[PDB]
């Protein structure tokens, strides 16, 4: 990877970039014919939001997602991991990938509510004041429809709407 | 008239009671009710639910044996389904044929 350091010496600023250590993909993928990191390791349909060991490889130090052109993921898998990372952040499973705060900023205390499988952003959702009849019930989404094809070990399929 | 129609409900409620009691007894051994009833039939054990409920209350050691038998037969089913026919039939999966 490449870093950038800004140093001000004698009323003069010097901008430089250095190449740091870069991690390498593990040798001998079980499926060399695979076209992306996911299918090269037979991971398609076999990872979830809480698989941070997988998810953490495709995000930036501050929690941002990495471009698809750099990681090599396909559009389908890149979108699945994108949703998985949002749910991982909301679940509190990435405590060392928090947003960068400018000097002098200390967030004010906010109510702590444990949550998981959170599709939407908390602030953008309204209460369900009118539930509606049984034949037209307003449902609360749980999980993501992108993961509908994940391997199901139970006879009941994933319920995405509660 | 209620007394006459109650004869249907009595039989219905009794079987509901046995299933609840068998379900409670099965959970003590980590088995769900469908697994116990389903696999006991596959072992040619024709004990009905009335007797199964009585055994759970008054014969707790025999019921655990029945739960173990059903659990054993259940694991044999999984092994068979996972196999491609290479494996022989399970010891408890063999059916006694009559003629």
């Amino acid at each position: 990877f490449r870093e950038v350091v800004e140093t001000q010496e004698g009323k003069t600023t010097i901008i430089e970039g250095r190449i740091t250590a870069t991690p390498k993909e593990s040798p001998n993928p079980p499926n060399p014919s695979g076209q992306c990191p996911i299918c090269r390791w037979n991971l398609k349909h076999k990872y979830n939001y809480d698989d941070v060991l997988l998810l953490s490889q495709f995000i930036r130090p501050h929690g941002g997602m990495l471009p698809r052109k750099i990681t090599g993921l396909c559009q389908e898998e890149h979108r699945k991991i994108e949703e998985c990372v949002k749910m991982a952040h909301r679940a509190g499973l990435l405590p060392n990938h928090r947003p960068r705060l400018p000097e002098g900023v200390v967030p004010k205390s906010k109510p702590q509510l444990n949550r998981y499988l959170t599709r939407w952003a908390p602030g953008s959702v309204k209460p369900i004041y009118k539930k509606g009849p049984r034949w037209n019930r307003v449902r609360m989404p749980v999980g993501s429809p992108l993961l509908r094809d994940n391997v199901c070990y139970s006879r009941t399929p994933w319920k995405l709407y509660h | 008239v209620k007394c006459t129609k109650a004869r249907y409900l009595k039989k219905k409620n009794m079987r509901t009671l046995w299933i609840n009691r068998i379900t409670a007894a099965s959970q003590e051994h980590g088995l769900k009710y469908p697994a116990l009833i389903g696999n006991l039939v596959k072992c040619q054990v024709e004990l009905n639910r009335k007797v199964l409920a009585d055994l759970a209350i008054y014969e707790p050691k025999t019921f655990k044996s029945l739960a173990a038998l059903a659990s054993r037969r259940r694991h044999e089913g999984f092994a068979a389904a996972l196999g491609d026919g290479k494996e022989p039939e399970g010891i408890f999966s063999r059916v006694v044929q009559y003629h």
Binding site: T22, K24, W41, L53, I70, G92, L93, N114 | -
Partner: protein, 177 residues
């Protein structure tokens, strides 16, 4: 068992004290467990008229976790009886107002809708934190397994686990990550 008739009856119909830890658990799965125990449906000697329910003690109800966006979407409705008395609050608002209401209401709705329900609720003991009175603490018998497995945060993984998972891709050396 060779017991005397009265000790035999006492033992079989005794009330057990169960402990449940609600930390990071969905209230519904907690309620599903407590509901079975409060009714006595976990006993082979169960009968509705046998008053064979047990005691359920749930701790850490302040730390329950909903899936999805239920904190914002789930609404609790009540009516004081007076004109304009209809009140609707989200789960988040109710949780901060009363740290046992969510778990209590989930259990109350799962119990049978009969005159025994309020008696079963007398056998339910909810505590928002890890403090339990000494009397209730002394009579506990068994702790029930948590219904939901709590996922590990990335900072909780041991280096053995991190090393075991392969690196899946090779980033470019000239990329400003």
């Amino acid at each position: 068992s060779s017991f005397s008739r009265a000790p035999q009856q006492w033992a079989t119909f005794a009330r057990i004290w169960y402990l449940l830890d609600g930390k990071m658990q969905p209230p519904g799965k907690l309620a599903a467990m407590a509901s079975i125990r409060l009714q006595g449906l976990h006993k082979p000697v169960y009968h509705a008229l046998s008053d064979c329910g047990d005691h359920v003690v749930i701790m850490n109800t302040r730390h329950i976790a909903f899936s999805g966006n239920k904190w914002e979407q789930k609404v609790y409705s009540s009516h004081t009886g007076y004109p304009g008395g209809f009140r609707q609050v989200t789960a988040a608002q109710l949780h901060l107002r009363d740290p046992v209401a969510i778990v209590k209401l989930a259990i109350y709705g799962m119990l049978p809708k009969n005159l025994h329900r309020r008696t079963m609720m007398e056998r339910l003991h909810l505590f928002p934190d890890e403090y339990i009175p000494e009397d209730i603490l002394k009579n506990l018998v068994e702790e029930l397994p948590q219904p939901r497995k709590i996922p590990k945060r990335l900072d909780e993984y041991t280096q053995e686990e991190i090393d075991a998972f392969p690196r899946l891709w090779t980033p470019p050396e000239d990329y400003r990550l």
